[PDB]
């Protein structure tokens, strides 16, 4: 359900997923979740992972969301001829490049964070990895 | 022979007078029933004061066959009119108390002694 | 042990002591004579060639006449080969009787069935005859469809349609023998055997249990 | 590999001969012959047996250890012998030994007859007890497995044939 | 026994073995941990 309340424009182009990621350095926590491959991250996956992490950590520690969809996706309804204008928006996704940090954890031990990220990787449609905070 | 959709009489005093053979039991793709067999019948007309009514469906046992019965010595037992004995659905027990008409000896072979015992003929 | 070769003259029922009728087939068997004996050294397999009946001298030509004279056997109606049982041995020229079937109690009969000529699809493969009414036109005993659409694009081998029936070897297995006569040379086998009256029949011991 | 690093020593009264890749450990408890893999070499030496691989083979010591274990089994089989223990639990379970023939009755509709190998002997000191004597562990193990497969016990009542040292699972099941 | 793509040691007494080129798990404690399709 993570979706901007107001948008300047209703529709967006298809776009591309070239280049490298920007948010690769951890700046809010100690243990971070980083993507390994390109893909599309729907909002539903985001709140599913957030709920899974809340269930795994027994509601202790702090949770940071480093990604927001900010991009709509249009799907044509069934049995509709091509054209006749662009379709309406159904769900919003976030485009990320490899190396983008997804989630960052604090107040958790190493093994708990590792098992939580292992559980999260299943809901993630792309390969993830475990990283830790490094000075500067 | 006896097959489905066959007009059949009664050999017992249960209360029915004419019964309709519409299904023959014994196995898949069962075509005909011999002299001793289990068949499914429907009542077409019966005495209003009899033990059975109109439209009831129950199991019956053949007693006489128009075509005949093949004896081991090349003998055929023809009959004039085909009848059956009314039996309960859950248990193979005769409903009528008496049997009117000839009965073949083959019914004894397949362990049907109730009809044989109370039969005033063969 | 080997079987015999005989001719069918008819079939008749047999009355038992309890009154049960047993329809059996009457086959006359002539005293067969061994014409050749085969071995591993020469032909690579063991078998014996026998003949039955008699044939007219004028009809018998020089090749088979010399073949018979080599074995010291007179003319015969035909020649047949029987395989041995890995230990049974036969000599050339000895006669074969019929009482040896007093213990097999189960025989196999092979012969040429009655020729029905060119038979239709309904008679050959026991097909289902189409409706003769309800608008049907010129299609009653026709086979009908013989394949699918252009995707296979051909008719598969072994498809069932009209052909020539009979006049071929037919084997009937597990036939019970009732009585055998030595002085009259008759064999009584329960059941029906293929072929017509007077046709040559080959009787062999049952191979199954 | 590391298991083969300890040479095995045959006891007295046992003769060992080598005819290539065939080994014989015949002696007091019978004669047996086993073929090798054509890859591990045994060297004639003092009263001990050593094992070594051939250069150019990936397995080498991995199968040399297997060969060492097999020779260790066969030497004690031909010097001390191999004993297998089997017992019957449950009513209607009868067993006996007559010569080289054993009969089993496990509630079947017909007696069960099993044929023992030449170098395997069986005895029945107790009516519900069968002891197997042999010179090779593999043969007696196969015989015991064949006997067990007929009436493998269930975890409800434990009825069937079983080994002495084995343990079965007991389940408290109640339904239907 | 269960056949599934993912095979893991459910308990401490689950031994991973390779039989006939496939991954199998044998549990000496109790046979509910038997898996295939490794």
């Amino acid at each position: 359900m993570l979706q901007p309340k107001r948008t300047k424009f209703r529709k967006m182009h298809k776009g591309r997923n070239r280049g490298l990621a920007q948010g690769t350095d951890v700046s809010f926590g100690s243990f971070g979740l980083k993507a390994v491959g390109r893909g599309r991250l729907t909002a539903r996956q985001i709140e599913a992972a957030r709920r899974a992490m809340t269930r795994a950590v027994k509601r202790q520690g702090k949770i940071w969301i480093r990604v927001f969809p900010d991009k709509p996706i249009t799907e044509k309804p069934l049995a509709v001829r091509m054209g006749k204008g662009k379709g309406n928006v159904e769900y919003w996704v976030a485009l990320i490049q490899p190396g983008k940090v997804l989630y960052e954890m604090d107040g958790v031990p190493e093994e708990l964070a590792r098992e939580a990220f292992k559980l999260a990787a299943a809901k993630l449609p792309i390969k993830t990895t475990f990283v830790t905070k490094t000075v500067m | 022979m006896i097959q489905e959709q066959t007009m059949l009489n009664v050999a017992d005093n249960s209360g029915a007078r004419r019964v309709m053979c519409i299904k023959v039991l014994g196995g898949s793709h069962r075509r005909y029933a011999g002299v001793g067999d289990i068949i499914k019948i429907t009542i077409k007309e019966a005495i209003p004061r009899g033990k059975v009514k109109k439209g009831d469906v129950l199991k019956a046992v053949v007693v006489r066959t128009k075509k005949g019965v093949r004896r081991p010595d090349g003998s055929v037992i023809r009959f004039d009119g085909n009848a059956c004995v009314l039996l309960n659905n859950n248990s193979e027990q005769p409903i009528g108390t008496r049997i009117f008409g000839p009965v073949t000896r083959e019914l004894r072979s397949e362990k049907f002694m109730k009809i044989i015992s109370l039969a005033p003929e063969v | 042990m080997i079987g015999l070769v005989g001719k069918k003259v008819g079939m008749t029922r047999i009355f038992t002591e309890d009154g049960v009728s047993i329809p059996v087939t009457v086959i006359e068997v002539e005293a067969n004579r061994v014409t050749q004996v085969k071995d591993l050294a020469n032909d690579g397999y063991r078998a014996i060639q026998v003949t039955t009946g008699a044939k007219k001298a004028n009809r018998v030509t020089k090749p088979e006449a010399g073949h018979f004279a080599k074995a010291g056997v007179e003319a015969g109606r035909g020649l047949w080969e029987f395989r041995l049982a890995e230990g049974e041995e036969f000599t050339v020229g000895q006669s074969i009787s019929v009482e040896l079937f007093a213990d097999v109690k189960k025989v196999d009969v092979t012969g040429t069935s009655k020729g029905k000529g060119f038979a239709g699809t309904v008679k050959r493969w026991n097909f289902r005859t189409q409706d003769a009414t309800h608008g049907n036109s010129l299609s009653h005993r026709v086979p009908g469809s013989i394949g699918q659409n252009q995707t296979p694009g051909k008719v598969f081998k072994g498809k069932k349609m009209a052909g020539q029936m009979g006049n071929e070897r037919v084997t009937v297995q597990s036939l019970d023998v009732v009585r055998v006569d030595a002085e009259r040379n008759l064999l009584l086998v329960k059941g029906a055997v293929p072929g017509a009256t007077g046709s040559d029949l080959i009787v062999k011991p049952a191979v199954k249990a | 590999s590391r298991v083969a690093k300890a040479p095995v020593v045959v006891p007295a009264g046992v003769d060992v001969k080598i005819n290539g890749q065939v080994i014989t450990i015949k002696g007091k408890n019978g004669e047996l012959t086993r073929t090798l893999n054509d890859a591990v070499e045994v060297k004639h030496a003092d009263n001990t047996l050593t094992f070594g691989p051939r250069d150019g083979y990936a397995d080498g010591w991995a199968q040399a250890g297997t060969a060492r274990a097999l020779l260790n089994s066969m030497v004690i089989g031909v010097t001390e012998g191999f004993t297998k223990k089997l017992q019957l639990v449950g009513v209607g379970y009868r067993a006996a030994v007559k010569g080289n023939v054993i009969n089993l009755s496990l509630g079947f509709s017909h007696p069960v007859d099993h044929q023992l190998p030449a170098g395997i002997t069986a005895e029945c000191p107790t009516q519900t007890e069968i002891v197997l004597k042999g010179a090779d562990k593999q043969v007696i193990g196969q015989v015991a497995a064949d006997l067990r497969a007929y009436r493998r016990p269930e975890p409800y009542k434990g009825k069937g044939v079983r080994y002495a040292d084995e343990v079965v699972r007991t389940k408290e099941a109640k339904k239907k | 026994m269960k056949v599934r793509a993912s095979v893991k040691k459910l308990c401490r007494n689950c031994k991973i073995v390779k039989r006939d080129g496939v991954i199998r798990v044998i549990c000496s404690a109790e046979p509910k941990h038997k898996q295939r399709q490794g």
């Binding site: 069934l78 049995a79 | - | - | 109640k174 | -």
Partner: protein, 338 residues
Amino acid sequence: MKFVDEASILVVAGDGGNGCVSFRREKYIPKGGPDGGDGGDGGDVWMEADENLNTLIDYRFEKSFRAERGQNGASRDCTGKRGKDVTIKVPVGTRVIDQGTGETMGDMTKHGQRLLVAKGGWHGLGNTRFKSSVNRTPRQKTNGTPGDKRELLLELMLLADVGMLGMPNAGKSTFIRAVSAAKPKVADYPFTTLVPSLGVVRMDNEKSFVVADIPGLIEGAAEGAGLGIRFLKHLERCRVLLHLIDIDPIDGTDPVENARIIISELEKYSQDLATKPRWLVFNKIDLLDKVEAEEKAKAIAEALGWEDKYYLISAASGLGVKDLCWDVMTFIIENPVV
């Protein structure tokens, strides 16, 4: 097997079929119309009353019973098949209470009775059922109504003909040994049995009766703090209530007070059990080797103040077991009201 009540089962009614939005196109008719078959009716869960069954051990594991999903409506006006009915075997005498606003839907009366617990979901109508002048190309789909997810509690009433009540010191469990062969736990410690068990005394093929042993209670079990008085509920259906008094108990050493203490909780459970014609017999007679056995048994009879016919039986082996069974089944014959 053993008689255990309070069985819980959860059942879901079959979900209705799902319609499909399809249009018919033929060789010469590009505009055929909406051609989508309706879904199939969801499966309906059923139950049967079984005279033979007398226990709920088959529902102790809280098995989930699933009714098959109604076949989804296929194209070209193909209606999906309705789901097959699911039937659960239920004994006679059970009442069912739901979880949350629970109520008794029905009580078992006779074998073969059918009761509806959850009705299957309705089928999903296709596009063929909503065409009109206003809309000629229906693209909407109607999902089938979901099935009824309900929790069922199965409670079973004891069907035994003879009920047993006595202190754990009495050989109530070993009394089954002399009268039948059921093999419950028998030992020299109090509260040997934790659940009531069943048993049948078939002395003759024509006539037999069912006797059940019930775990004993303690002096304080009336108020609670032990097993409670909940096992007294498995009564009021047995024709006779057999009672055993343990003569000269090793740990009791007070036959006068423990004989009358049985009636204390008996008179205060719910209605004193309507004062059913209970009997009074003794046990452990083989312990007393000679004439000394019966005068003290007669002496304790006057303490109760009942003065009716009494039996001297030893549960170890025989000694009045054979003829007491005849007297028990005799009382069964004259009274056919259960």
